[PDB]
């Protein structure tokens, strides 16, 4: 039983879903992360099976602005009438820069997961990550955080929920290994559109050639990763700096002031002695980096592990191919 934790099984994303994702591929939300649709499915053998999606559009002029839910309500009735029902068991934002689970995506997920615990959150990653590995990134939210439910505030319940120490390298389910049983029709088209009408097959396959030759793919990956990751690294370092200074470096001075008092005045207070430690905002363990930021350490290691791999393959192929 590969099934998930405490309300749900795995996910299976039927091919006709992913066709409909790559229709709103990476536009209508390029430089803006836009939730491009809800994943509607049903509980199947050892898995969910997302059998259909409908896209959720928004006001994408160059910024994203949430709209009336007149769309979603009418469109989930539109699904219900010819097909099944509104059975939203997840969602997919493709969207912007190879798979990354932002703090906002963790928060939108937290609202989604606590409401319906039959859920995953997809991140459909096409050619942008140099394609590359883990094109379909699933990820559901730890049921620990759905038991120490809201909210991770800056001082209380940052420290306290950091001390509970729920996962932030948390498991991601596999998505496909099996016959989906809607292989059927698209199987029949393969013999037609190979050999005797392999126009559109060969067109798709020869995309590979120009994924290598031209403008700066791995170069631009490593460039964007030279900027994206150093931003995040610097942030933790100056975050950690100030908090560790309130933790120790301020205790150092005020306790050396506690020296001077001699730690007690018998006739009257001890105002000064009392008014040593008066709270700065972090007493320990700023949580939203420790959890949500660390979900993106994992994703940044993934992007690095992805961008590496196709490099490794060339470093075999290049040497070897010329060696003849």
């Amino acid at each position: 039983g590969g099934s998930g934790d405490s309300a749900v099984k795995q996910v299976q994303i039927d091919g006709l879903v992913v066709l409909k994702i790559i229709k709103h591929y990476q536009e209508e939300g390029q430089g803006t992360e836009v939730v491009q649709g809800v994943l509607l499915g049903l509980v199947v053998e050892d898995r969910l099976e997302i059998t259909n999606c409908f896209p959720f559009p928004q006001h994408t002029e160059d910024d994203a602005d949430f709209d009336e839910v007149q769309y979603q309500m009418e469109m989930m009735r539109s699904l219900r009438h010819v097909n099944i029902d509104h059975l939203h068991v997840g969602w997919y934002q493709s969207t912007y820069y190879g798979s990354f689970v932002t703090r906002a995506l963790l928060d939108s997920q937290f609202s989604y997961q606590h409401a319906i615990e039959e859920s995953v959150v997809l991140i459909y990653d096409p050619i942008k990550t140099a394609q590359g590995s883990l094109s379909l990134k699933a990820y559901r939210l730890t049921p620990k955080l759905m038991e120490v439910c809201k909210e991770k505030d800056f001082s209380p319940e940052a420290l306290k929920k950091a001390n509970i120490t729920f996962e932030h390298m948390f498991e991601e389910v596999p998505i496909v290994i099996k016959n989906s049983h809607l292989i059927n029709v698209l199987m029949w088209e393969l013999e037609k559109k190979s050999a005797v009408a392999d126009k559109h097959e060969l067109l798709s396959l020869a995309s590979s050639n120009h994924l290598g030759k031209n403008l700066q793919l791995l170069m631009d990956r490593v460039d964007e990763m030279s900027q994206d990751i150093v931003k995040y690294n610097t942030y933790m370092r100056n975050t950690s700096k100030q908090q560790q200074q309130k933790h120790q470096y301020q205790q150092r001075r005020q306790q050396e002031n506690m020296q001077r008092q001699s730690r007690g005045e018998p006739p009257l207070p001890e105002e000064d002695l009392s008014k040593l430690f008066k709270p700065p905002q972090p007493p320990a363990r700023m949580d939203s980096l420790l959890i949500a930021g660390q979900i993106n350490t994992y994703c940044q290691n993934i992007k690095e592990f992805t961008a590496q791999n196709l490099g490794k393959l060339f470093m075999a192929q290049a040497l070897q191919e010329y060696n003849n």
Binding site: Q308, K312, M315, A316, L319
Partner: protein, 107 residues
């Protein structure tokens, strides 16, 4: 050890019968002279190789000439080794360690 072979045969006192009394010792040291000649000469002069082996005559040198296949050259040195065969560099050539490095970086 410092390979002052000229000084070695000068340094010898010939009245110490113990040094005559070790069998094959006089030739053994000569065989070690010629051993290190092969490692670090490409050629050696006929008079030079004689003097290192204790100021040998023309006929005495015929043994040592024949021993490692060495033979005369034009005007007039004794051949010892080919120039590319003596040097044997094993210098700059690596960065071919792809196979192992990709086997460990495989996963």
């Amino acid at each position: 050890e410092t390979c002052h072979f000229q000084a070695f045969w000068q340094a010898l006192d010939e009245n110490m019968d113990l040094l005559e009394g070790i069998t094959g010792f006089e030739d053994s040291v000569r065989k070690f002279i010629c051993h290190v000649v092969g490692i670090t000469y490409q050629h050696i002069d006929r008079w030079l190789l004689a003097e290192m082996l204790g100021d040998l005559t023309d006929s005495q040198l015929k043994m040592w000439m024949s021993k490692y296949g060495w033979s005369a050259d034009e005007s007039g040195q004794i051949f010892i080794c080919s120039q590319e065969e003596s040097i044997k560099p094993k210098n700059i050539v690596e960065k071919i360690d792809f196979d192992s490095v990709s086997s460990i970086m495989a996963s």
